[PDB]
Amino acid sequence: GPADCCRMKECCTDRVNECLQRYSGREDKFVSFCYQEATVTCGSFNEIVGCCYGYQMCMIRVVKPNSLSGAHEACKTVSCGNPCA
Amino acid sequence: GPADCCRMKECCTDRVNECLQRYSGREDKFVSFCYQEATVTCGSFNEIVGCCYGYQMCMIRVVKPNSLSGAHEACKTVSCGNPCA
Amino acid sequence: NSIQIGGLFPRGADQEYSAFRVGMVQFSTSEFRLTPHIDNLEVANSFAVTNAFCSQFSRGVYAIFGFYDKKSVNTITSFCGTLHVSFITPSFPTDGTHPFVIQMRPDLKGALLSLIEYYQWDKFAYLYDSDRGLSTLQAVLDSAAEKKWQVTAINVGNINNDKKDETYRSLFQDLELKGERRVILDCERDKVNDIVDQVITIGKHVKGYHYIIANLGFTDGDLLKIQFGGAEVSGFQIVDYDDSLVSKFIERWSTLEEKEYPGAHTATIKYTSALTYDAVQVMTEAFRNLRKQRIEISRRGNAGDCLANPAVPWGQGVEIERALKQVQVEGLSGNIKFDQNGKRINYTINIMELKTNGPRKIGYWSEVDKMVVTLTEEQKTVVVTTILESPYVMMKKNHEMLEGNERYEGYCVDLAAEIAKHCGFKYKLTIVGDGKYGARDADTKIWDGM
Amino acid sequence: AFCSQFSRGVYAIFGFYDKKSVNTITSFCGTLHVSFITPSFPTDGTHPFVIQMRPDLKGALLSLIEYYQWDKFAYLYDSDRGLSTLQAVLDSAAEKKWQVTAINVGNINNDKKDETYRSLFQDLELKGERRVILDCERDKVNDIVDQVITIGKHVKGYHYIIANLGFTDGDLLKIQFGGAEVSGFQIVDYDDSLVSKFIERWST
Amino acid sequence: INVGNINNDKKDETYRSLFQDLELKGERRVILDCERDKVNDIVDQVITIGK
Amino acid sequence: EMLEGNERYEGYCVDLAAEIAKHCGFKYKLTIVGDGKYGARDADTKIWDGM
Numbered sequence: 072g073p074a075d076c077c078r079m080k081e082c083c084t085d086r087v088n089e090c091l092q093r094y095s096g097r098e099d100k101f102v103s104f105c106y107q108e109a110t111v112t113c114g115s116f117n118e119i120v121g122c123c124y125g126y127q128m129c130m131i132r133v134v135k136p137n138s139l140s141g142a143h144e145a146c147k148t149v150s151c152g153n154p155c156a
Numbered sequence: 157g158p159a160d161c162c163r164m165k166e167c168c169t170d171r172v173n174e175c176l177q178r179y180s181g182r183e184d185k186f187v188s189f190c191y192q193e194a195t196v197t198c199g200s201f202n203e204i205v206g207c208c209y210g211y212q213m214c215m216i217r218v219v220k221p222n223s224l225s226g227a228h229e230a231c232k233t234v235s236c237g238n239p240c241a
Numbered sequence: 242n243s244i245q246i247g248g249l250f251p252r253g254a255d256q257e258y259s260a261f262r263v264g265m266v267q268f269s270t271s272e273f274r275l276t277p278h279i280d281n282l283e284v285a286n287s288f289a290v291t292n293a294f295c296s297q298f299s300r301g302v303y304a305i306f307g308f309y310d311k312k313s314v315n316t317i318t319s320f321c322g323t324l325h326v327s328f329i330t331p332s333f334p335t336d337g338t339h340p341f342v343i344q345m346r347p348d349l350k351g352a353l354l355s356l357i358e359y360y361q362w363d364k365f366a367y368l369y370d371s372d373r374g375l376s377t378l379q380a381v382l383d384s385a386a387e388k389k390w391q392v393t394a395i396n397v398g399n400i401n402n403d404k405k406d407e408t409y410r411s412l413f414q415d416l417e418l419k420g421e422r423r424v425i426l427d428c429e430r431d432k433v434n435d436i437v438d439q440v441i442t443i444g445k446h447v448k449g450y451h452y453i454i455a456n457l458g459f460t461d462g463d464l465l466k467i468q469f470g471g472a473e474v475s476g477f478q479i480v481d482y483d484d485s486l487v488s489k490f491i492e493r494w495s496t497l498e499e500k501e502y503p504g505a506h507t508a509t510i511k512y513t514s515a516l517t518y519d520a521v522q523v524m525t526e527a528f529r530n531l532r533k534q535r536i537e538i539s540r541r542g543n544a545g546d547c548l549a550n551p552a553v554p555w556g557q558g559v560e561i562e563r564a565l566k567q568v569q570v571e572g573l574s575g576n577i578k579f580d581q582n583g584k585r586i587n588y589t590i591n592i593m594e595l596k597t598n599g600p601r602k603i604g605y606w607s608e609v610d611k612m613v614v615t616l617t618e619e620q621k622t623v624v625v626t627t628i629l630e631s632p633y634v635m636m637k638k639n640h641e642m643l644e645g646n647e648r649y650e651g652y653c654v655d656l657a658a659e660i661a662k663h664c665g666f667k668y669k670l671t672i673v674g675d676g677k678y679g680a681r682d683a684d685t686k687i688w689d690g691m
Numbered sequence: 692a693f694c695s696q697f698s699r700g701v702y703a704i705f706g707f708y709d710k711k712s713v714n715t716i717t718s719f720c721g722t723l724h725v726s727f728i729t730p731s732f733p734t735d736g737t738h739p740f741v742i743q744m745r746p747d748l749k750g751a752l753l754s755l756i757e758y759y760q761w762d763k764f765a766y767l768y769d770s771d772r773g774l775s776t777l778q779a780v781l782d783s784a785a786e787k788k789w790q791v792t793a794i795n796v797g798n799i800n801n802d803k804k805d806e807t808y809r810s811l812f813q814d815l816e817l818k819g820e821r822r823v824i825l826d827c828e829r830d831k832v833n834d835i836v837d838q839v840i841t842i843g844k845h846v847k848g849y850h851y852i853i854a855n856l857g858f859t860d861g862d863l864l865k866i867q868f869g870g871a872e873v874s875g876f877q878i879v880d881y882d883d884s885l886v887s888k889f890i891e892r893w894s895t
Numbered sequence: 896i897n898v899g900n901i902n903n904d905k906k907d908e909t910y911r912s913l914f915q916d917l918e919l920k921g922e923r924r925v926i927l928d929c930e931r932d933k934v935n936d937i938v939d940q941v942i943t944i945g946k
Numbered sequence: 947e948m949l950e951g952n953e954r955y956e957g958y959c960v961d962l963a964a965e966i967a968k969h970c971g972f973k974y975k976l977t978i979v980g981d982g983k984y985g986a987r988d989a990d991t992k993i994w995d996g997m
C-alpha cells in the first residue's frame with residue numbers, strides 16, 4: 072500500500088532492537104545483521120541506505136556487549152539522515 | 157546536520173497548518189501556497205516532492221473553507237509517500 | 242531458672258531439630274536452662290498451626306521458635322502480634338512491618354538484584370513458585386520497570402507433578418524460541434532439583450546458559466549434576482566454612498553420632514538448620530541480657546485461653562521482644578543483629594560461582610556496600626568451504642585415485658594452502674552443499690551458500 | 692469470630708476474607724467441615740467447603756486484551772486481591788509476544804501519595820505507553836483515575852482497561868468526556884427484567 | 896462569547912457545545928474574563944473535556 | 947588566506963572526508979600532520995613517524 076517515513080523509522084529501530092535481543096552478549100557483533108533484517112521487514116526507499124541509516128551507525132559505534140538496552144534507548148531518537156542516497 | 161524524516165514531517169504539517177490559520181475562509185485556496193512555504197521552512201529531500209506530499213494531497217482534497225481545524229487534524233497522520241520521488 | 246519456650250518443627254525436619262538440640266547443649270549455662278516443648282505439625286495447615294500456637298500459649302511459654310508457610314505465616318504474625326508472644330523463625334522473611342516476630346533469615350533481594358547488575362543482565366527469565374511469597378517477584382518486576390529490563394515471569398509452582406513432563410519441555414522450548422539464555426531460579430530446593438534434572442534431560446545445561454539459584458543454600462544441595470555440564474551457575478551462601486567458628490562447629494557436628502542426632506553426620510549443614518542453631522544462641526543471649534538488666538519476666542499465673550474474647554496480652558512480652566531485638570551476636574550466619582521490626586541487619590551474603598573444579602566464592606554482598614568482589618582469577622582442523630569455479634577450484638583428472646585436499650586444484654586451492662601455511666593450521670577443503678556463493682532468501686530470510 | 696460462630700453451632704457461614712486471612716478460612720472450614728460462602732476473590736487451588744460467589748475474571752481479561760490486539764501495555768496492580776491475575780497475564784505474556792510493565796500501586800500510602808503518581812506516570816511517559824490496565828479495587832481505581840485527569844492523560848490517544856466486575860459501580864462521569872477509550876467488565880446487567888425489578892424495589 | 900447568561904441549573908452541555916464550537920475554529924489561546932466562581936466552573940469544564 | 951578551518955583545504959581526500967564524516971555522523975576538523983610524513987617505523991628507536 073502507501074509508504075511512509077516516520078512509520079518506517081519507528082518500525083526500523085524496533086525491529087533492529089528486537090533482533091539484537093536474541094543475540095544478547097554478542098550484541099555488538101550482530102548490529103548490521105539485525106539492521107539487514109529490519110531493512111527487509113520495514114522496507115527502505117533506497118535498499119543500500121536502509122530504513123534508518125543514522126540509527127544504524129549510532130548503534131554500531133555505541134553498542135557494547137550487554138549494554139544494548141541503554142544504547143538503543145539513546146540511539147532510537149537519532150536522525151536517520153537522507154533516505155535517498 | 158541530518159534532517160531525519162519524522163522531524164521533517166511534523167515540521168511540514170505544523171508549518172502548513174500554522175500558515176493556513178492565517179487565511180480564514182480562503183483555507184482551501186491557499187493550501188499549495190502554505191505547502192510551498194512549509195517545504196521551504198522545513199526543507200525537503202526532493203525539491204519537487206516537498207516536506208510531506210501525501211499530507212499536501214490529503215489537505216487539498218479534504219480542506220473546505222472554514223473547515224481547516226478538523227481537516228488538518230485528520231490529515232496530519234497520513235502517510236507522506238516517497239520523499240525521494 | 243527454668244525458661245519455658247515452645248517450638249514447632251514440621252514433620253520431616255530432622256537436621257533442624259538436631260541442630261536445635263546441639264544449640265541447646267552448646268549454649269547451655271549454669272545460670273539458666275531453656276526447657277523446650279517441641280510440637281510436630283503440618284506447617285502448611287493453618288488450623289494445625291493455630292492449635293499448636295494456642296497449645297504453647299496455654300502452656301505459658303515465654304517465647305516460640307518455629308516455621309511457617311505462605312498459608313500459615315499470617316496466622317503466626319497476627320496471633321503473635323495480638324498475644325504479644327515472640328516468634329523466632331528461619332523461614333522466609335515477611336514483607337511488611339510485623340511486630341513480635343524475629344526473622345533469622347536475611348533478605349536476599351538486594352543480593353540478587355546486585356548480582357543481576359553485576360552480570361549486566363538486560364533480559365532474562367524468572368522462574369518462581371508461590372511458597373516463600375511473591376515479594377521477590379514484585380521486587381524484580383519493579384526493578385525491571387525502573388532499569389528497563391525485559392523479564393519473563395513464569396510460575397512453575399502451579400504445574401502438577403503428575404502431569405508435568407512435556408510442560409517443562411514446552412516451557413524451555415518457548416524459552417529457547419526467543420534465544421533467551423540467562424535464567425533465574427527462585428524456588429524451593431526440591432523444585433530446583435526437579436527443574437535441574439529436566440534441564441539436563443533436555444540438554445539445556447550446555448554452554449551458553451547461565452543459571453542463578455536464589456537461596457542461601459547454594460552449596461547445601463547437590464551441584465555435581467550440572468557441574469560438568471558446561472553451563473555457568475551462580476548463587477548465594479549464608480554459611481562460610483572457612484571461618485574458625487564454623488570450622489570447629491563442623492568438626493563437632495561431623496563427630497556426632499547419627500543415631501542420636503538424625504542427619505547430623507555430614508561435612509556441611511543446611512542453612513535453615515544453621516539459622517536454627519544461631520536462633521538458639523539469640524534466645525539464650527536475649528534472656529541473659531534480661532537477667533543482667535535485672536528485669537524479671539516470670540509469669541505470675543497461667544495465660545488462659547488464647548481465643549478468650551477479648552484477648553488480653555501479658556506485659557512482660559514486650560520486654561522479652563525488645564530483649565530479643567536488641568541482641569547482637571556472632572554465629573554461623575555471620576554477624577547477627579536486628580532492627581526494630583525484627584528483620585536481619587548487617588549480614589554478609591557470600592556470592593559464589595560453580596566452576597569445573599567445584600564451587601568458589603567470587604565475592605560478598607553487604608546491605609550498604611552492595612556487591613564487593615574477592616580475589617580476581619589443542620589445534621582443531623580448520624573447515625574451508627569453497628565452490629567449484631575455473632580456474633579457482635577444479636577437480637583433477639586422476640582425482641578418483643586421491644582423497645581429501647589432494648582432490649582439488651586451482652588458484653583458490655594454492656591460496657588456501659598459503660594462508661594455512663602462514664597462519665599455521667591444518668585445513669580441510671570442502672565443497673558447499675547448495676552450491677551457491679551467498680544470498681539471503683526473500684521468503685525464509687535464511688542465508689544460503691558459503 | 693469463626694470459632695465463635697462454630698461454638699454457637701451454626702450450619703453455615705457467609706463472609707469475606709483478605710489475602711492474609713483466606714488461608715485461615717479455607718483451612719478451618721475444610722477441617723471443621725463448615726460451609727463458607729463468600730463474595731470475596733476466588734481462591735486459587737482446590738479448596739473444599741468454600742463456595743465462591745465471585746466469577747473468575749482471568750479469561751475475560753485475557754480475551755479482551757487479545758480482542759484489542761495489545762502488543763505492549765502497562766499493568767497497574769495492588770497486593771489486596773493477590774497477584775494471581777498478575778501471574779496469569781505474565782505467563783500469557785510469556786506465551787505471546789506481549790511486552791508488559793508491571794507496577795505495584797498498593798504499597799503506596801494514601802496520606803503521602805501525590806508525587807508518587809506523578810513519578811509513576813513519569814516512568815510511564817518514559818516508554819510512551821498509551822495502553823494501561825488497572826487491576827485494583829474501586830477505591831484505588833477512582834484515585835488513579837483522578838490522578839490521570841489531573842495530569843491530563845485522559846485525553847484522546849490513551850486506552851484504559853479496568854479489571855473488575857464493578858465497571859459501572861465506580862464514577863465514570865469523570866473521564867467520560869475526556870475522549871480516551873475506557874473498557875471494563877460488568878457482572879450485573881441492569882437491562883435484565885429481574886435486575887430491573889430489583890432496582891425498582893431498591894431505589895425506594 | 897458571553898458565559899454570563901448561562902443558568903447554573905441547566906448548564907452542562909452548554910459548555911460542551913461552547914468548546915465544540917471553539918474546536919471548530921481550532922482556537923487554543925483563550926482569555927477568561929470572569930468572576931472567580933464562573934472562572935472555576937469554566938476551568939473544571941475544561942479539565943473534563945481534556946482541553 | 948581569507949578562509950578558516952576545513953574551508954581552507956580542497957581535494958579528493960577532502961570531499962571523501964566530508965562524505966565519511968557525514969555518513970558516520972561526527973564533526974571533523976582537518977589538520978595537517980606535524981612531521982609531514984605518511985608513516986614509517988624507525989629501525990632503531992622503534993618509533994612510528996607520520997600520520
Ligand SMILES: *[C@@H]1O[C@H](CO)[C@@H](O)[C@H](O)[C@H]1NC(C)=O
Binds near residue numbers: 586
Ligand atoms: C549495619 O546497619 C545498617 C544496615 O542497613 C547500616 O545503616 C549500618 O551502616 C551498618 N553498620 C555497619 C558497621 O556496616
